[PDB]
């Protein structure tokens, strides 16, 4: 680089510019630890509200293993089929894109319409609300990793 | 000497001329010419020859060619924050700024001396060709707040409409004018 | 979707109307895990936090090239009844992004 | 070559008592006079306002102009990246409270304008700030001039 | 020290018509002839081509092949901050166009060629490009010279 | 002339003072006065002046003022952390000492010489005025291992005297020395 | 004076002189000897030794030489990318690359002056030197098609055998360098 007065000033000129862009940079980091701060309590109450699903679930599960007996628990089992229809649809988030879950949980894809086995319909239920209970820790959590490597990039 | 600003000739003639047109050699690096300097030029004859414009021209030139200047400023405010963050970080209406102050400069801006119509241009082409990026800037603008995206406003055919008025003759503009101004109005009432 | 967990629950997971299969030691999981990732699975695996509390860490040579299945790590039998911290692997995971293990 | 260590500007500077700076951006945005009040500074303006002479709310009201103008000009290049809604109401508050201040306070054009009307200018611009956002004024000031409408100098801007 | 600002060079290009001028970094990549096309100019140009001369398409090409080069070097810069992953889908062809240019119309090595070759190959690197983004030709000479692969000489 | 510390006669004189007192004007912004730079500036004749301030004002006025340095050295090394994470959600060993340099900086590197009991500080009002931070500090620190909120401990009554102890006059100050020395032994033990 | 490159004494040089041996601060201030900057020192008189080389060591000298100078400037360009997003991001066939730089850097450029066998290499070990790394680096590049890791291949034994190869004397490197060709033929075909 040849020395000029020309080149000193506009060299003078990127400092100054460099001297604002860090100070932007940190504002901009400052706003995006203010937005993680919130969503990592959203996934905490999440995270126990999951638990709380498990917990209920499970017990009702035991509780038709025990009385109603693995013979009844196998055929719904067997009657009720997997589900096959999901949507990931995107969400963005600073210019990034994210996935965000949405089951469609649909009509006939749980059989036995009967009450008799009292013991296996409420597990069913149980599991049925521990399925979007997982889907809400799941959205909250990809969220919080992606802003984490957001912050990481801008640091 | 080297293209140097601080030469004694040049700093002495900076303070007795009214207009200071500074060239700069990375514009003409990659052949954009006239190659002026906007950032590093000036004129003080603007605010005298006001009253013939408007009754030479147009009564809204002034007005225009203000609002032409400030497009050029807010482009040359964001190019600092495009330099660090790269273009694809700003939101769509910055992003509309900076396509908007690529059209001026490719359009309006550079001229062909060698051509066989863009070598000279009268008065009211030029108040035409700012007329349409005025218009299609406020349109543009417009569509955004309908939430509209930015990467298919630019697609529009009527970019390649306005790209190449500088090459309809003299003759021809005043009704490619009208036409293109048509246009942008039958494009931009309806666009997805 | 899919959920991988000890079997005792996996004729629980599919009453829910969702795949479920058993898994009792470390490795099996695992590799019913990348069985599972390297078939084209759902957009959600489901993982028992008592064995493989870090699922990605294992599975990532396959799922940074593709990343449309989420893992995730869910309680396991013997723990739930008993409870576990939240609060302690919420703190771990602030650890893992911002690293100054300092929140309240 | 607007630059501030040439030695006829930096001989200047250690005789004379402050300066004041015209700005390239505000004379390309419009604004004339083109005056840029952040790098402006008078030294000996201390023993010349309050009370006796001028108004007693002179230098409070100058000092809180500058710290929310100040304010929102590094709010308005933050907003380009992160966006409008991203912010908060006193953000918000104090990206409107700039470019009022930009286009009512300094694009004056050809007036003469009184101590009195600048005054009552700058009232009207700090009203659009809540209360208690103005730390630097003491209370028996604000409770006698806050709260005007700026629709004033509208008329004819 | 590879300064045009000294003396010697300034006061020549201020007499002379033109320069051509070598570039060391196309030299170090084993490029030959390293010749720098943004940096040289003939200001005799325009006197002898054209219709008539060597071909009417001559001096489109010569402007559309400069712009293209140069946004092919602006993303280049931009590629060292943001990284290649990150370009939008249009950016990439103007690095590919950059890379090709520099490894085929500048690395001619010892052969001899006429001028419908250099042609020939200058309208196969603008192909590459969409053809909306040519700005600089006449449609008439897009219609008539546009839509040739480069396969079919260096492949 | 910049205010670079590089300039020829500023690298003169900084050869031979004995003592550099440097100023700037971001403590003026937030009314800190003297806006002296305790991290930039020294002096070389703290070892030699011991023996007189330990003969004439107090046998330990060495060893706790190099404690009070080192607590305001502390202080700095936090600003890491405070730069990311907001400033409340430390933990109680770091927010303890936050707040104590705080009270060290807006009560005693914080000086006005427009009251009469202030102007003129003499050496034994300072060395009281640090033993009370000090054992302020201290005690804190003892209640925290107790196991205590550390907003009880950011607002215990006991902690105005140190703001109220630059007004005492200077014959006055040993009685409300001995007087905050015998208050502060009170408070923290038994609401800790 | 001072490294500057630009002094009259050193460009009035590079005029007449037909081989350029550029030093660097930077290598010698790690112990990297003899520190030869690569990136800017060149020779003219490559070209005509050709015919020599071809007759003398082996007649296929000028393509390995050639190899090894495009591995060091693929390596030198991958720097670059390396700086900003650490060694792990990159792929395997890109931290082959950068590994396979650093054994030619480590182990054939870098030379001892005050050992006893070292400081004295004739052309036939070095021609040996270069067909053993290029030899490892080929078997390296198959391999990782297969699905090894780089973490399995960078673990081998006989990167060892590389390293130590420029201490074996004069007398002793034949049978060394068949042992080593031999081994690392083996090896990758022991490893998956």
Redo the contacts between chains.
Sequence with gaps: V?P???NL?QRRGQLR?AQ??V???????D?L?AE??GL?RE??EA??A??QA??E??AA?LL?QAFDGPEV??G??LG?????G?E?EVENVW?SKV?R?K?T?PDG??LSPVGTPAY?LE??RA??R??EA??R??NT??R??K??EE??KT? | PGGDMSEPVTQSTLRIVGAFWRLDASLAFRRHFPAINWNGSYSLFTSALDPWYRENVAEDYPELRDAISELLQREAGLQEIVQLVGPDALQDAERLVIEVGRIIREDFLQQNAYHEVDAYCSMKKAYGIMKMILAFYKEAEAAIKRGVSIDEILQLPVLERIGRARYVSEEEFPAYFEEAMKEIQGAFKALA | MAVIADPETAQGFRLAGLEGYGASSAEEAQSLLETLVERGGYALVAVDEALLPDPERAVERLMRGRDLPVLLPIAGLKEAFQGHDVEGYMRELVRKTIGFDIKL | DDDRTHPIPDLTGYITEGQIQLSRELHRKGIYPPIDPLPSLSRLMNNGVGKGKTREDHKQVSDQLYSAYANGVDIRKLVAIIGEDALTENDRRYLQFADAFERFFINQGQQNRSIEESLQIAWALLSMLPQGELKRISKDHIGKYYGQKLEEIWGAP
């Design positions: 040849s000029t007065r020309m000033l510019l604002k862009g100070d932007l940079l940190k504002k901009k980091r706003a630890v993680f701060f990592v996934a905490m995270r126990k999951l638990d498990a917990k679930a499970y599960l038709a628990v196998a719904a089992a009720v089929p997997p589900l096959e999901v990931a210019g996935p879950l089951a949980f894809a749980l296996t597990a069913s599991f049925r521990y399925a997982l889907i820790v799941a959590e990809t919080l990793k802003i984490g912050i990481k640091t």
